[PDB]
Amino acid sequence: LRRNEQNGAAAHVIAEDVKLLQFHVATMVDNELPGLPRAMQKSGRPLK
Amino acid sequence: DDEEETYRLWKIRKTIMQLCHDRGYLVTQDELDQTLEEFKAQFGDKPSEGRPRRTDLTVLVAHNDDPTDQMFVFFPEEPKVGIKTIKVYCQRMQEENITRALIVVQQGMTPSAKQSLVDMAPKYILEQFLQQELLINITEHELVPEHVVMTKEEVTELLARYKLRENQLPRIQAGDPVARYFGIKRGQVVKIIRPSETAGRYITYRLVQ
Amino acid sequence: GPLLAFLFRGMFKNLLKEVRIYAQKFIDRGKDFNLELAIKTRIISDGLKYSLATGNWGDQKKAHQARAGVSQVLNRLTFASTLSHLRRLNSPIGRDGK
Amino acid sequence: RIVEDAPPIDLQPPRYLLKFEQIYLSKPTHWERDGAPSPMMPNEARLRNLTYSAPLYVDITKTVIKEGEEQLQTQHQKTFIGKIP
DNA sequence: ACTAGTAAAAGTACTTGAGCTTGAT
RNA sequence: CAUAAAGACCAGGC
DNA sequence: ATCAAGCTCAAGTACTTAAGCCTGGTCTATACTAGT
Structure with missing residues (x-):
């Protein structure tokens, strides 16, 4: 995200970037929230 | 009719x-x-x-x-x-x-x-x-004990001869039908005198807030 | 019968699906078409052997939405333990309800 | 019943089609790593940590559709799909 | 071709919905 | 002495 | 005669919850795609 705000991106790519950054800092604290399809690493096993 | x-x-x-x-x-x-x-x-x-x-x-x-x-x-x-x-x-x-x-x-x-x-x-x-x-009259019912409203000096000997603060008493909210029977506002202590089967008589206190 | 048949339709469908996905890339060039190299053989074999080997009656990548407890290990203390284990029914109602 | 009742792969100018016709079952046979067949015993399957499974073969026919007044179908026999325990 | 990236009740808490009373008129 | 991971499911004992 | 402001009661839609301790077993790490 940092290089794509220092290179002047299309500003609608950034929405799909801050959206996924929101998901990746918001799953690590609370994974089992209702809605928001879960994160998983291997064998379909969701994270702790 | x-x-x-x-x-x-x-x-x-x-x-x-x-x-x-x-x-x-x-x-x-x-x-x-x-x-x-x-x-x-x-x-x-x-x-x-x-x-x-x-x-x-x-x-x-x-x-x-x-x-x-x-x-x-x-x-x-x-x-x-x-x-x-x-x-x-x-x-x-x-x-x-x-x-x-x-x-x-x-x-x-x-x-x-x-x-x-x-x-x-x-x-x-x-x-x-x-x-x-x-x-x-709910005061004459089987379950309801005797309530006696306490004056201020008597509250002073309660909070002085048990070495309590005022919040450390049990409580009662001023919306039950008995404290509306006696017309009691916030800050007043009711004395409840009820007979028990272990000692014979027990006197407990309640702060109205 | 009616468990390995249900397990077999879902891997005849999948093998025909990668027959299509191998088929479309080899037809845009218009060269020819082949099937002795189109058929990936690990689908049916590794799928039946997988869901018999571990119990979870489904896929590997969906290993938590599956009804486990089918295809378990045969019991060999006494001969009537074995004859009871080969003759056993089971109902899928959950085992914490009251 | 499963290999018969399957949707075909109609897809396109020339186009290639194939259909599955009749299925054939062998008794279990061990294919050793050097590429040799032998009928394997269940005790051999227990002691060596093998699988007591049998390979599966099927027929495939193939049709071309190009409308060059020539319909050349090519028939196949005993095409290896997989192994059934 | 070989091998490394890879997407059952049951309690509460919050929201909307309909209708009321009341000051304005 | 030191090193034998860890998760998922299953069958059991009181 | 209708017209908003403010408020109460009722129904609809999610979140959270289910005994303790102990002993053995088998299986699994992703099948698929681009670097190299």
Whole structure:
């Protein structure tokens, strides 16, 4: 995200970037929230 | 019809006579043992298009230890009461210079009138009851123990000879029917005297807030 | 029968699906078409052997939405333990309800 | 019943089609790593940590659609799909 | 071709919905 | 002495 | 005669919850795509 705000991106790519950054800092604290399809690493096993 | 309604008016009136008898006012003994026929011959036979109107049932009583303190008992005519009737009764209380009042509501209230009863707090404190609630004295029931309201010196020896603070007592909220039977505001301690099967008698205390 | 048949339709469908996905890339060039190299053989074999080997009656990448407890290990203490284990029914109602 | 009742792969100018016709079952046979067949015993399957499974073969026919007044179908026999325990 | 990236009740808490009372008129 | 991971499911004992 | 302001009661839609301790077993790390 940092290089794509220092290179002047299309500003609608950034929405799909801050959206996924929101998901990746918001799953690590609370994974089992209702809605928001879960994160998983291997064998379909969701994270702790 | 009308015999059930005058039965209700007798039983409500008797309940209010024990109520202000228990709050600490001056009540003659003749209207406490008032049989239905003395009511029926004094105030009238039927309230259906009749002589007990729900007007001329009002009761004005006076305190024992001070002759200034009086309390008025209003029996409103219309079923649900607005603000205008509360301004009528508050006007009569304004010109007659009386502070305490009861409003035995027939069917129910309106919430802006209730906000018009809680807003005059430091002067003109009015209380709201219901006809369905006043047909039995809850203090004489099997489960309800003896409540005795405590003066300020006695609260000082409670909080001084147990070495408590004031918040460290058990509590009671001022919306149960017994603390509305005694008319208790926030900050006052009721004493409850109940008989037990381990010691014989137990005295506990409650802070009203 | 009616468990390995249900297990077999879902891997005949999948093998025909990668027959299509191998078929479309080899037809845009218009060269020819082949099937002895189109058929990936690990689908049916590793799928039946997988869901018999571990119990979870489904796929490997959906290993938590599956009804486990089918295809378990045969019991060999006494001969009537074995004859009871080969003759056993089971109902899929959950085992914490009351 | 499963290999018969399957949707075909109609897809396109020339186009290639294939259909599955009849299925054939062998008894279990061990294919050793050097590429040798032998019928394997269940005790051999227990002791060596093997699988007691049998390979599966099927027929495939193939049709071309180009409308060059020539319909050349090519028939196949015994095409290896997989192994059934 | 070989091998490394890779997408059952049951309690409460919050929201909307309909209708009331009341000051304005 | 030191090193034998960890998760998922299953069948059991009181 | 209707018209907003403010408020109460009722129904609709999610979140959170289910005994303790102990002993053995088998299986699994992703099948698929681009670097190299």
